[PDB]
């Protein structure tokens, strides 16, 4: 192969990567999107580790160049997310916005008068205009 006028024709996924050892430049022009090509380039070199979904807790598995990464939800973190979390409002205030009250070890974000707990259970929302502790804007 490798004809004189191969680069002039428009790119095709089969022509570049499936029928030949495509490099980064040749694959990008077929797709025109950097984000799309990066996903295809990561699996090309080291396969798709995310196919079996090694991580736990519905981790958003991400394929890279020789590594895997899953971003998991609250209560389960880490590369594997197979272990839970000590809530421990001592660090980063338990991801709250106001006071924590330690019941059995689940972080309990709280809000005082003129404030309301959020849907996610971490933020506080004032009940009315000009609540306590805020600069006038």
């Amino acid at each position: 192969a490798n004809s004189f006028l191969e680069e002039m024709k428009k790119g095709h996924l089969e022509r570049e990567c499936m029928e030949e050892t495509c490099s980064y430049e040749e694959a990008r022009e077929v797709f025109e999107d950097s984000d799309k090509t990066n996903e295809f380039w990561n699996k090309y070199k080291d396969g798709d580790q995310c196919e079996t979904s090694p991580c736990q807790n519905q981790g958003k598995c991400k394929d890279g160049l020789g590594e895997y990464t899953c971003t998991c939800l609250e209560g389960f973190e880490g590369k594997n997310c197979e272990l839970f979390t000590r809530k421990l409002c001592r660090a980063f205030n338990g991801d709250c916005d106001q006071f924590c009250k330690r019941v059995q070890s689940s972080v309990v974000c709280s809000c005082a008068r003129g404030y309301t707990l959020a849907d996610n259970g971490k933020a506080c929302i004032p009940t009315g205009p000009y609540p306590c502790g805020k600069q006038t804007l």
């Binding site: 916005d97 924590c100 005082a112 008068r113 000009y130 609540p131 306590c132 502790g133 006038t136």
Partner: protein, 234 residues
């Protein structure tokens, strides 16, 4: 306020100014609700009759922000004495409700445990008022602010020649010319947290003003939150 910076427009809305019969500012205050103001106990003796002005960035001029409010009920701790300045706390319920507006906002009251275990272990508080710019000076008509770093209880009991009671905490510098001075008493000592300011202390007293070797002294609000909430039911 020795040194520090002037309060900007809306920068210190929690600051309520007390004015005597002559409408001259002598002590500061903190807005707790639409009807209540937080001040210090020993400020009540300075005039024996006073009015509360809110939203004033300058005592000597009127700019459409001043609001002189009459006071309905004055409540102060009984155990408070001028010999020790202990239990230096007082709350003023006004005759008329406080109309929250620009440069007029109340201040929070955090939970007792969370304030002690997190707020009393932060880095720096905030203090403000209309005190003297220097010791034996003149109370500036403008509203100033000062960033008073917290000091550990053991560390700041050494410098003070008078006992620091459990209801008192120190903030300031053992060397620097930064401390609130005469005319700042009853001013807030608030604590910042995620852009939300919580009341931590009330300006109780201080040996001198910003003396090398000294910090300002404040009365721990968290020791009287049940007292404050009960008094706020007046």
């Amino acid at each position: 306020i020795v040194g520090g910076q002037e309060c900007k427009d809306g920068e210190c809305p929690w600051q309520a100014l007390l004015i005597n019969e002559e409408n001259e500012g002598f002590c500061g205050g903190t807005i707790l609700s639409e009807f209540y103001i937080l001040t210090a106990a020993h400020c009540l003796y300075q005039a024996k009759r006073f009015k509360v002005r809110v939203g004033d960035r300058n005592t000597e001029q009127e700019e459409g922000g001043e609001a002189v409010h009459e006071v309905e009920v004055v409540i102060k701790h009984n155990r408070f004495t001028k010999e020790t300045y202990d239990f230096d706390i007082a709350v003023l319920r006004l005759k008329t409700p406080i109309t929250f507006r620009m440069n007029v906002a109340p201040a929070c009251l955090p939970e007792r445990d969370w304030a002690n275990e997190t707020l009393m272990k932060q880095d720096t508080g905030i203090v403000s008022g209309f005190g003297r710019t220097h010791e034996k000076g003149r109370q500036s008509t403008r509203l100033k602010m000062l960033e008073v770093p917290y000091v550990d209880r053991h560390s700041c009991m050494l410098s003070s020649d008078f006992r620091i009671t459990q209801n008192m905490f120190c903030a300031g510098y053992d060397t620097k010319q930064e401390d609130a001075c005469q005319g700042d008493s009853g001013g807030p000592h608030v604590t910042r947290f995620k852009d939300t300011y919580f009341v931590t202390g009330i300006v109780s007293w201080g040996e001198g003003c910003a003396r090398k070797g000294k910090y300002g002294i404040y009365t721990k609000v968290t020791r009287f939150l049940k007292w404050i909430k009960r008094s706020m039911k007046t």
